[PDB]
Design a protein around this motif. Sequence first.
Motif, short mmCIF file in Angstrom:
data_model
loop_
_atom_site.label_atom_id
_atom_site.label_comp_id
_atom_site.label_asym_id
_atom_site.label_seq_id
_atom_site.Cartn_x
_atom_site.Cartn_y
_atom_site.Cartn_z
N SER B 31 -26.98 -14.21 -33.59
CA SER B 31 -27.01 -13.70 -31.98
C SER B 31 -26.27 -12.18 -32.04
O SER B 31 -26.79 -11.41 -32.79
CB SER B 31 -26.33 -14.66 -31.26
OG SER B 31 -25.38 -14.29 -30.13
N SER B 32 -25.25 -12.11 -31.34
CA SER B 32 -24.46 -10.81 -31.24
C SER B 32 -23.11 -10.77 -32.18
O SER B 32 -22.49 -9.93 -31.93
CB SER B 32 -24.24 -10.54 -29.91
OG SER B 32 -23.47 -11.53 -29.10
N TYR B 33 -22.98 -11.68 -32.93
CA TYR B 33 -21.59 -11.79 -33.62
C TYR B 33 -21.74 -11.06 -35.14
O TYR B 33 -21.74 -11.72 -36.13
CB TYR B 33 -21.49 -13.50 -34.04
CG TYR B 33 -21.05 -14.12 -32.66
CD1 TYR B 33 -22.01 -14.34 -31.98
CD2 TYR B 33 -19.73 -14.49 -32.38
CE1 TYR B 33 -21.96 -15.15 -30.56
CE2 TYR B 33 -19.42 -15.21 -31.20
CZ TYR B 33 -20.45 -15.54 -30.43
OH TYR B 33 -20.17 -16.29 -29.23
N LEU B 55 -16.98 -0.44 -29.37
CA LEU B 55 -16.39 0.33 -30.17
C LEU B 55 -14.77 0.17 -30.27
O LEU B 55 -14.50 0.07 -29.01
CB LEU B 55 -16.74 1.87 -29.58
CG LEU B 55 -16.61 2.84 -30.78
CD1 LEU B 55 -17.72 2.95 -31.70
CD2 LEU B 55 -16.81 4.48 -30.11
N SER B 61 -16.64 8.70 -30.58
CA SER B 61 -17.85 8.10 -30.05
C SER B 61 -19.16 8.42 -30.71
O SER B 61 -20.22 8.02 -30.10
CB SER B 61 -17.71 8.84 -28.54
OG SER B 61 -19.06 8.90 -28.02
N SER B 64 -22.18 4.14 -33.08
CA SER B 64 -22.83 3.24 -32.23
C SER B 64 -23.65 2.07 -32.91
O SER B 64 -23.85 2.35 -34.12
CB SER B 64 -23.97 4.15 -31.19
OG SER B 64 -24.90 3.99 -32.29
N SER B 66 -25.95 -1.55 -32.72
CA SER B 66 -27.07 -2.07 -32.00
C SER B 66 -27.70 -3.28 -32.84
O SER B 66 -27.53 -3.38 -34.07
CB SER B 66 -28.14 -1.15 -31.43
OG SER B 66 -28.85 -0.60 -32.54
N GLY B 67 -28.58 -4.28 -32.17
CA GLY B 67 -29.37 -5.12 -32.80
C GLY B 67 -29.14 -6.55 -32.20
O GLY B 67 -28.50 -6.62 -31.24
N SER B 77 -24.06 9.55 -34.98
CA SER B 77 -24.90 10.52 -33.91
C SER B 77 -25.00 11.95 -34.90
O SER B 77 -26.12 12.38 -34.90
CB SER B 77 -24.38 10.81 -32.66
OG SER B 77 -23.04 11.55 -32.79
#
Lengths: 230, 238, 238, 268, 261
Positions: B31-33, B55, B61, B64, B66-67, B77
């Motif tokens: 999941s998001s863990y 963060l 900053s 970043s 995701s997933g 970045s």
Amino acid sequence: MDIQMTQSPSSLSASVGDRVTITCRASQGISSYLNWYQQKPGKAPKLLISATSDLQSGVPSRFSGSGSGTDFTLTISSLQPEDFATYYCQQSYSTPYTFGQGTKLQVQLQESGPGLVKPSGTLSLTCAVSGDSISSSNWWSWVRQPPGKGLEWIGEIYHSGGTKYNPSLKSRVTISVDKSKNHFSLKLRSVTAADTAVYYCARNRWFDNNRGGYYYYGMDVWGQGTTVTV
Amino acid sequence: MDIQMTQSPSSLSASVGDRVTITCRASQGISSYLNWYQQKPGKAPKLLISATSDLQSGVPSRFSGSGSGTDFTLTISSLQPEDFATYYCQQSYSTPYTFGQGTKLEIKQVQLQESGPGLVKPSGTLSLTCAVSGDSISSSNWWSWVRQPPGKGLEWIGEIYHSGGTKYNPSLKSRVTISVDKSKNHFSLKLRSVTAADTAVYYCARNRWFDNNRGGYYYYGMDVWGQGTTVTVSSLVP
Amino acid sequence: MDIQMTQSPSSLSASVGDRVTITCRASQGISSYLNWYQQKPGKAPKLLISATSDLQSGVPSRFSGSGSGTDFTLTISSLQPEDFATYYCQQSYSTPYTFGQGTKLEIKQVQLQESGPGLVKPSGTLSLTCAVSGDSISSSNWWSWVRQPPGKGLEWIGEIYHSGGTKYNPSLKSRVTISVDKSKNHFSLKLRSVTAADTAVYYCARNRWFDNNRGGYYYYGMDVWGQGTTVTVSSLVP
Amino acid sequence: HMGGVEVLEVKTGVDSITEVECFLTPEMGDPDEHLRGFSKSISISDTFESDSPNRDMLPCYSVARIPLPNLNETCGNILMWEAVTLKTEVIGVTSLMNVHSNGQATHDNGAGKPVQGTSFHFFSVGGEALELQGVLFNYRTKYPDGTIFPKNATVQSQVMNTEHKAYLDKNKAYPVECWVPDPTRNENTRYFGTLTGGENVPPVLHITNTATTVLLDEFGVGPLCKGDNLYLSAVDVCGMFTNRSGSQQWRGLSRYFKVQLRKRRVKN
Amino acid sequence: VEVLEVKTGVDSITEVECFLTPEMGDPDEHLRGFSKSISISDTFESDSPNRDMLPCYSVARIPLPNLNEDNILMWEAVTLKTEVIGVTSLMNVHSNGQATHDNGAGKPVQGTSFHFFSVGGEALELQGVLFNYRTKYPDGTIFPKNATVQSQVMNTEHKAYLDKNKAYPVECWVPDPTRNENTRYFGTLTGGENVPPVLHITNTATTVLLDEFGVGPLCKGDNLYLSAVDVCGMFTNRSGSQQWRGLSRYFKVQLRKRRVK
């Protein structure tokens, strides 16, 4: 929920009168929540199709959409000269909204702001809404397009102040609204080279298509766009 | 649950100002863990991101994440000189907590302190203590042990709660003990029957959960680390 | 349920001090119901690990296990001369119990006793007895027969409970009888209509379950083995 | 004694009534020092023959014997305490709203799965020990040391074997699954029980201090307390708790009893 | 108190009417009536729920017309009408929900409910019982103190008065059956994660508060105590996170004057 949108082919050369089919794929099922846009060179993207297959008012009857869950198709019945453009799919199933990388073949919003920002500085832009109230039942969005690249959804604000942000930008973005002036704003902190892009403001509104379930959203009105270089 | 994390690429060189992306895959859905860590050479790992995309305060900053489920991405970045480091993913979905193998990126307060013997004889008992300063042992978090063998790669040993409950890596459970002493504000590690495979840098860490309003199982991340202490297995005694 | 276990690699050459990992795959999910055995040349198999990762008492803590569902690993942390042997996985999820084909590793108290005729004519009846000492037949466990044809892996024949209930391998059910006699504290095997395929070392074993608090179906493992008795099918009589 | 005695008039006067009030705690198995009120993880045998449940996995009947004020000074023309009314309720019903501790998520990012599944709620008030009849789901179950269970079980014990007669005369000993109140006896007890089976059934627990049960039989006679002792028994298995792994444990709660008694004369 | 006869006359009766609002946790300025999203601890020992995740008992102390100026008279609570207010709000299956299935309606509020109310002449008396004695209850709640493993079944040390709002977590406390002589209480726990709310409303139903002896709650100091819990179930938002949802409770109590000594 992170959903990646892959289109095919990257580019297509065809001759007037031919039947063109562009396709896209979702990294996970997205049911029927899929939109198609047309971008002519130097212009803002234009919404053609919402909800897999609902043609927008004013887009010619030769455009059609189909698909389900993971695979979709945009189809032109007979190509004509005006159809030269880049075509983008966009999943509307889950934020952050994601677009495909693109295939190379009245409410009014206007955006203003500096245009050159020093590295580590703060990008700041404002979208002027004309012909409609900010307090209407839609989201007010920011989308950006880096040079020679696809579209990235930044975030959205509701007239009541609620925001939704791209998790990639959450730590440095603010979007605000001022019903006094009927404008909404974008602040992006700590800019770097990756932030040079044409920035668009847009109306992300829902469509009463009587399909049921989660609201079907599509960005149906776009500002001219402003270039910001860092 | 047995969850293997695979990271890609295993190494990368880039120039200041570049955009770099590091990928990881989980052997099953998590999941998001998912957490990300940055480890500069010779230093303890530092928590960058908890719960896929949150963060840490102080992390610039330009980082970043995701997933979902099986596949995750850490993005920088615009690469900057301070970013030369090995980056580790870690699934927090299920114990034993597992890390990826690390991506080495080359470019062209609470206090914890480990102590104990630097040398252990083969088949002897390794013994270490982590002194906790500027925070009570009786806080609502786990107190963890993590080790990094010379070839790098982080392995979670286990952790303890102030009231005495423990969770151990099933690979070590027959020979590990973790203890806690509220009156001395420290927690300890004992590893029996050591072999050469136990030669490593040993870290103590605070494994705390994050009030991120997502719901469900607590989201844990190791946000405070000790400096690390080397323990070498050797038959020779000075 | 018919569950085929496949082990990898089939053979392995390593040096003292190496880290060694053997894998096995089940033809369908078996959750955590997976055991590992060590068989030294000419000896009975010995249970190392029950329920994916629970180490038997007396087993050196350099052995560990992990895995889930269909994929499992046995790991030796640091290989030592003791460990030359063939290693078998065994699913305990469903009868008939099935073993992997074995991984031969080359490096660079209850007692059970089998007895019975060493020779059987073709089409004759093989008959063996397993004497149980230092434990009652009336204990809460199964009494099993396992056989090992010449250099060719392990086959579970069946098991009996002290109250007389039996479980048989479906490949043998037509020709096999297992019996128990509490007054003599033994149990017995009969195998009818033997052919050359029945030439093998026959083991008896205690198949007992482990109070490991995981819940659900009982977790079984064969923790005590007899020394094994060879039976040869031959037309020639001495 | 309801039958071995002649039951005569009720005594009146100020000192002719008394009240008993108490809690019976549940006995779910208590597998370690942290798990009072829970059973051990339920483990499933591979055959009926090999069923050998751990003691800590088997809920038992709870029982208390409450001494009453001594009457008389024997047998003959004598006074006995008679139980007239009962108030009872389950204590701690809101604890089942803890869906945040060591639970299994109902779905990703959801709350914990609450206590649910098979329940047995049972209570009795008698003038002597509850009388039990043994009935086995599986007569080849091996019940563990430290429990009192139906002995010399046969296949007939799976429906009705009149050999299995017992008294609920010890705590943490009589497993709920092997014993039920003996409907052929218990003339001097009033008992009430509900079994709700099923692995998904939700607990439905009512509390109030406004409800009274009358304990008098058809002839206006309540339980008569032999030797001046009142016997209370309870089972309150609320359902099962599920851990993240899926292992499940019985969860029980305490029961409150308030019994009103009056003096009654009896003979023989 | 020796409880004597009921006073008659036109001035001898009075009425209390009010709403008790729910205390579900109110995690922010938009979420009155809701709890914070529920989080699940990894072990019993590490259970440290946020204050905003724990519904609490609601309580209102209602002053009555002063009697006796400075044998005395007491207000006696005789009858109760009560119901949950806003039961139809649970038909909103279109706001911020999780689709039951593709293109379906939102999943409604459902799951564990606790509906409870008490009328008393003094504060409701509480007994502590813990699901898990090792739970860390948060600052700003009033919770069973010096908990032991016996707190999971019955620890007589955990006695309290329901004497403060937003303070006493529902999951920690029940009415103490060994007390509450001067209170009438009624509650129902319905467990399970898919159980549907069943809510009745009518203005035609009266509950009588008198006991065996014809005596209702007697209001000490001319104060009526009303308590309530109305956890209706959980709301599921699209991500799957779940929040307790509660509703207000209406009370109308008729009282009469009674002489006591």
